[PDB]
Amino acid sequence: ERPTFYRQELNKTIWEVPERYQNLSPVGSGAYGSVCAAFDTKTGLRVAVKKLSRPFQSIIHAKRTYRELRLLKHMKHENVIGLLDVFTPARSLEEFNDVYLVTHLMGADLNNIVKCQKLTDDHVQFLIYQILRGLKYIHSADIIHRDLKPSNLAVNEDSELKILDFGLARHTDDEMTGYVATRWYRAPEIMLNWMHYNQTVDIWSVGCIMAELLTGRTLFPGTDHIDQLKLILRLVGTPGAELLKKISSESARNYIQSLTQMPKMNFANVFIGANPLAVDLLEKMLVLDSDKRITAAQALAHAYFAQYHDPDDEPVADPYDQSFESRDLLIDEWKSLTYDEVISFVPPP
Ligand SMILES: O=C1CCc2c(-c3ccc(F)cc3F)cc(C3CCNCC3)cc2N1c1c(Cl)cccc1Cl
Numbered sequence: 141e142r143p144t145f146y147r148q149e150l151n152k153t154i155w156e157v158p159e160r161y162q163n164l165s166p167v168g169s170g171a172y173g174s175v176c177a178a179f180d181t182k183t184g185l186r187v188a189v190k191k192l193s194r195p196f197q198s199i200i201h202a203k204r205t206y207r208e209l210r211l212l213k214h215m216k217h218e219n220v221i222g223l224l225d226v227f228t229p230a231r232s233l234e235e236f237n238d239v240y241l242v243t244h245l246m247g248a249d250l251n252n253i254v255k256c257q258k259l260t261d262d263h264v265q266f267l268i269y270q271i272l273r274g275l276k277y278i279h280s281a282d283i284i285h286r287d288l289k290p291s292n293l294a295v296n297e298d299s300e301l302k303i304l305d306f307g308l309a310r311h312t313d314d315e316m317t318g319y320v321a322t323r324w325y326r327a328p329e330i331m332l333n334w335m336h337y338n339q340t341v342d343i344w345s346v347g348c349i350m351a352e353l354l355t356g357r358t359l360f361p362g363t364d365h366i367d368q369l370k371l372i373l374r375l376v377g378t379p380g381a382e383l384l385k386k387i388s389s390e391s392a393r394n395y396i397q398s399l400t401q402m403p404k405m406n407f408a409n410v411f412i413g414a415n416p417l418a419v420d421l422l423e424k425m426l427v428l429d430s431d432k433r434i435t436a437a438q439a440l441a442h443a444y445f446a447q448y449h450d451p452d453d454e455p456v457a458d459p460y461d462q463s464f465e466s467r468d469l470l471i472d473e474w475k476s477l478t479y480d481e482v483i484s485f486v487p488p489p
Pocket residue numbers: 167171172175176177188189190212221241242243244245246247248249291292293294295304305
């Protein structure tokens with residue numbers, strides 16, 4: 141039941157997609173250069189189509205392509221970017237060499253919606269509520285986003301939000317260097333590789349985001365890794381004995397201990413004028429020891445979200461098999477696994 145595809149030049153490249161998708165138009169430069177907005181005449185939805193080009197140029201890239209497709213095919217939640225469609229114009233494994241991923245078009249990220257601006261409390265409640273609802277879902281499948289920030293939070297004009305780019309974070313040292321937003325939302329244990337981190341790193345990121353929505357200012361705009369750690373410890377206090385032991389990196393632990401001790405600050409005096417419940421929640425998300433941070437599920441039941449919380453409408457995910465991550469395969473093997481996933485795709489109802 142192969143649909144009919146048509147060709148078209150976009151961003152100096154040839155896009156070949158099923159007829160149902162019309163009015164393709166590039167959305168931007170940079171990482172936005174492989175994405176086009178379109179109208180899906182079959183569903184009547186405005187969609188976004190990302191073309192993965194030469195997804196099998198290397199072992200590493202072939203595995204990345206498989207990883208992204210597996211992740212996107214697994215997500216079926218209102219606050220998480222998922223797949224409306226995935227296709228290839230190829231008629232056989234032999235010819236298979238391009239992957240196209242179709243999802244909802246939100247049209248903007250949280251920055252474009254808040255950069256340098258303080259939001260009303262109700263608006264912050266709604267936005268953080270959705271981030272946590274989708275994060276609850278993501279974590280329930282044992283998936284860690286690990287690189288949550290405003291630029292990876294897609295929002296439409298009705299302020300509805302979908303989390304994207306989860307479990308794909310593979311930044312370069314250079315990209316994390318200096319005065320850059322790419323590192324401002326990262327939990328300290330991951331920024332400085334203190335220990336084997338887990339999903340709790342994502343809660344730290346939500347706290348950073350929430351504070352920014354409330355004040356209109358970056359919470360920890362470090363000029364570098366060290367300056368940022370300093371900004372963090374000034375607010376949340378230097379590690380206690382118990383946490384120091386959990387820092388398996390003897391190198392990191394040793395540096396940490398060289399710092400003059402500091403007590404956690406009073407958040408009510410940092411976030412002056414903010415809803416006391418929002419302040420309480422920030423204190424529970426921005427805890428240095430990741431073991432003690434509130435979880436997405438717990439945060440959803442926090443009073444700050446009374447107006448939105450509904451325990452019967454905050455679903456969890458089916459289990460996500462990521463055994464492939466520890467597997468070393470050849471390019472063709474990773475390519476063949478990707479092909480099976482493409483052809484076995486079942487459209488959402
Ligand atoms: O609305 C969406 C959802 C689809 C999407 C994707 C996307 C993810 C998975 C998929 F299968 C298809 C997609 F189109 C990627 C990015 C970029 C933003 C973050 N950096 C990487 C790419 C932006 C967007 N956008 C988007 C678009 Cl298309 C334009 C402006 C802002 C945003 Cl957030």
